Amino acid sequence: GTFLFTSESVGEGHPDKICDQISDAVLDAHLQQDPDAKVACETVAKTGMILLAGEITSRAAVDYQKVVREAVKHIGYDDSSKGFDYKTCNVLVALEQQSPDIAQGVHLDRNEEDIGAGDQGLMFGYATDETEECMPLTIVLAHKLNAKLAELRRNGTLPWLRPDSKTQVTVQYMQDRGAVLPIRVHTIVISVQHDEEVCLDEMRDALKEKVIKAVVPAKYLDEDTIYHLQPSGRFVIGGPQGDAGLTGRKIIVDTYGGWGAHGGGAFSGKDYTKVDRSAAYAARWVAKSLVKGGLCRRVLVQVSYAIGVSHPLSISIFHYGTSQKSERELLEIVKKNFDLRPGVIVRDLDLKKPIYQRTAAYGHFGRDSFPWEVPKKLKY
Amino acid sequence: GTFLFTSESVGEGHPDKICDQISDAVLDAHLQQDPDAKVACETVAKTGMILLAGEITSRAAVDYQKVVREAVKHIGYDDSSKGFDYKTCNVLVALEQQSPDIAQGVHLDRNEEDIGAGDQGLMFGYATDETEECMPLTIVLAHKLNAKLAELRRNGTLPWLRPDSKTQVTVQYMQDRGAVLPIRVHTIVISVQHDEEVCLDEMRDALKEKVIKAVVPAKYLDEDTIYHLQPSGRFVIGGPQGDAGLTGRKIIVDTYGGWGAHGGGAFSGKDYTKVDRSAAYAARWVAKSLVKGGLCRRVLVQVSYAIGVSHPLSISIFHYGTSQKSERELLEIVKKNFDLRPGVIVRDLDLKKPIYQRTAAYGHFGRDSFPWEVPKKLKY
Numbered sequence A, B: 001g002t003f004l005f006t007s008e009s010v011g012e013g014h015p016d017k018i019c020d021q022i023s024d025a026v027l028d029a030h031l032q033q034d035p036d037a038k039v040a041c042e043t044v045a046k047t048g049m050i051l052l053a054g055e056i057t058s059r060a061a062v063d064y065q066k067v068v069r070e071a072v073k074h075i076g077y078d079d080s081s082k083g084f085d086y087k088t089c090n091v092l093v094a095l096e097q098q099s100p101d102i103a104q105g106v107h108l109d110r111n112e113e114d115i116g117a118g119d120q121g122l123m124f125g126y127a128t129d130e131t132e133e134c135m136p137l138t139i140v141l142a143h144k145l146n147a148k149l150a151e152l153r154r155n156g157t158l159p160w161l162r163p164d165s166k167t168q169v170t171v172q173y174m175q176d177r178g179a180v181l182p183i184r185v186h187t188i189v190i191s192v193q194h195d196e197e198v199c200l201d202e203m204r205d206a207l208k209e210k211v212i213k214a215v216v217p218a219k220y221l222d223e224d225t226i227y228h229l230q231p232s233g234r235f236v237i238g239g240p241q242g243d244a245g246l247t248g249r250k251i252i253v254d255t256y257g258g259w260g261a262h263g264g265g266a267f268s269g270k271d272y273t274k275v276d277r278s279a280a281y282a283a284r285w286v287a288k289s290l291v292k293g294g295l296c297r298r299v300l301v302q303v304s305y306a307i308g309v310s311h312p313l314s315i316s317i318f319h320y321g322t323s324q325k326s327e328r329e330l331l332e333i334v335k336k337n338f339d340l341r342p343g344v345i346v347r348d349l350d351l352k353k354p355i356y357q358r359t360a361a362y363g364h365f366g367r368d369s370f371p372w373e374v375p376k377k378l379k380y
């Protein structure tokens, strides 16, 4: 019954993640002034460049240069020695209003509760009782390794660190009637951008002793655990200079690390009417409510929409064999307890609040008791 | 045992898909001259603009203006009345060489068979016996609906059609010990860009009679099937003008339509050393080989890598209950029959061949007998 499973995560300065965080900084800036802003902000990053491209209709007055540069500053790209600098990079803007054809079909002259979905699409929610926060251990550990690197960079413990990083964790699990039980960590990868002066051995020793041991419980690590630390051997060039980044290119890091499923939609840079985000958050809320409600140990929820239509077109449940109730019965419980119209999700999950930049690194789920992480008490 | 499942697809002129096709036109142009080109070409599309951003090291001499414009011409954006024109759009290039830090850690001075993975990451392959081509019926039908729209546009049957389209199909399935059996089509969505003169009723009638009936077998359609045809009511503005597109924003349309799983990596614009593409193609090849070999009715394969390391870090199998063999036994059969080092996959799947633009619309799998679609005869 033993098997392996692998998940990855990336740091705040990974170029795709920079784009997600800037897209969400833009969204938050609009929502602080206009809770009903319609935002579809894509970000592209390459050497010396942040480009914003997309569609925004809003009553807010947003200074894009300031918002972009402040987000890059927070990430830590503040000097040409690091490969990118918020003070001196190019910020280019290609933003137009939302298509009036989309606006008239989705929200114009619609009662909020009855607003149409902002697009068609499919979305999934997942939860697993293997951790208290109901997330896969593989991705929780991968996120925490990136967070630890940023913590040691910011407190000056390891001043050779730069903001761009990636981690990957392979866990060996056992299973019991579809539930999964972590046994040990089989393999860890860490790659992180660094300065020109630190040597490989110093970095590898610090990554094992100050990063991995500070995050992964010793009970999961043994003589057979495989460590791939700075496996490329050199990572001085990094950030957008090493690799072009785009918004919505880390959708699996944003969600379940390979577990569960994904409908394809990106979260960052989108207001609640874009069901790629709101319905995925609601589906996480449903899945976590079923697991914390004791109805199943693990569960996957699919939902889908048509542009301009409020009610979902389909809802489906997969319990991996971890419920005594059938998937049909669980689906009936979901339909009796949840209303997944976007105009209802916005109220239940408070989705006009400008907390989106906080979601754009380290995963959107299993952290900070955001509304979609607080289970709903189920009646049946 | 009945349940619903939904998948979507998009047309060649969907703005994200335009980007994938241009990224792969660039890759093919390089591979036609330099089979060993290192390509990481992202594309961004917004009103009047194609931007190329990324990293290419190649001995080829490529005329980016010609390659981009020819790809847009093929798609059908050839006039300002359609919202985008290959003859007159802006083509901007932000392409640099591959990072020397990546090159030295991945491939420089390495025997080809022993080249390192071009990045860390996780990838999945999936196959299902529900169709001859071993793909989910939901996504096969969704792709064929987009192909039919492009066919009727190009042959002048429905001259009001434009290249930007989306479709979505919900199938009602039965199940038998983990295998899935399609029963009927529950809901179909079609949204397609159109000219200013055609009315909604004309479009809805043509979509049902000339598109859906020409693709979906009548046995799946009944009095209860729900049709959402042009549900937004108006879609004159389209393509990049209606919505900014980016490479690698249709990764679920490119693969299994929500079924199976995804590791997060985008395919288009990348040469074989980027395991996001090559290892996902090899994992599809493994999954299809297990199903066509009669070992299981449905199967999921995970693989993972570390940058600079040739052998995968992990391989895992999930058979959904559709094999008499355990997942451990199937994994042993996979390890005895396949070598998933990128420098071996390139040879088995002929991945230096410039056929990538052909993969960049209508899904990378279940079509055209590409090498990853030809099962390997298994020994055990």
Ligand SMILES: C[S@@+](CC[C@H](N)C(=O)[O-])C[C@H]1O[C@@H](n2cnc3c(N)ncnc32)[C@H](O)[C@@H]1O
Pocket (backbone or CB within 6 Å): A014, A015, A016, A164, A165, A166, A191, A192, A232, A233, A234, A235, A236, A237, A238, A239, A242, A243, A244, B039, B040, B055, B056, B098, B099, B101, B102, B105, B118, B119, B120, B274, B307
């Ligand atoms: C390996 S790059 C993708 C391939 C790249 N576009 C190329 O031209 O080969 C993906 C991510 O890996 C990380 N990376 C960049 N340079 C690296 C290096 N020298 N060693 C390890 N990881 C690196 C960064 O997080 C980057 O965004």
Ligand SMILES: C[S@@+](CC[C@H](N)C(=O)[O-])C[C@H]1O[C@@H](n2cnc3c(N)ncnc32)[C@H](O)[C@@H]1O
Pocket (backbone or CB within 6 Å): A039, A040, A055, A056, A098, A099, A101, A102, A105, A118, A119, A120, A274, A307, B014, B015, B016, B164, B165, B166, B191, B192, B232, B233, B234, B235, B236, B237, B238, B239, B242, B243, B244
């Ligand atoms: C609905 S748009 C995404 C949201 C958009 N960025 C916004 O500003 O609201 C996603 C895709 O839907 C399609 N689309 C564009 N305009 C549409 C319309 N008026 N009706 C239906 N689908 C449309 C195109 O394929 C487009 O790429």
Ligand SMILES: CN(C)c1nc(=O)n(-c2cccnc2)c2cc(Cl)ccc12
Pocket (backbone or CB within 6 Å): A003, A005, A175, A178, A179, A180, A258, A259, A260, A261, A320, B260, B261, B300, B301, B302, B316, B317, B318
């Ligand atoms: C309990 N086991 C054995 C697994 N549980 C899962 O949920 N999935 C899985 C993950 C994502 C989508 N579909 C299924 C697995 C996937 C693989 Cl490749 C291997 C093992 C498992």
Ligand SMILES: CN(C)c1nc(=O)n(-c2cccnc2)c2cc(Cl)ccc12
Pocket (backbone or CB within 6 Å): A260, A261, A300, A301, A302, A316, A317, A318, B003, B005, B175, B178, B179, B180, B258, B259, B260, B261, B320
């Ligand atoms: C056989 N049935 C009942 C299903 N089979 C699947 O393979 N998955 C599935 C799809 C993707 C990832 N993990 C699992 C399902 C997912 C849902 Cl939400 C509902 C039903 C099924």
Ligand SMILES: [Cl-]
Pocket (backbone or CB within 6 Å): A016, B119
């Ligand atoms: Cl990456």
Ligand SMILES: [Cl-]
Pocket (backbone or CB within 6 Å): A119, B016
């Ligand atoms: Cl889209």
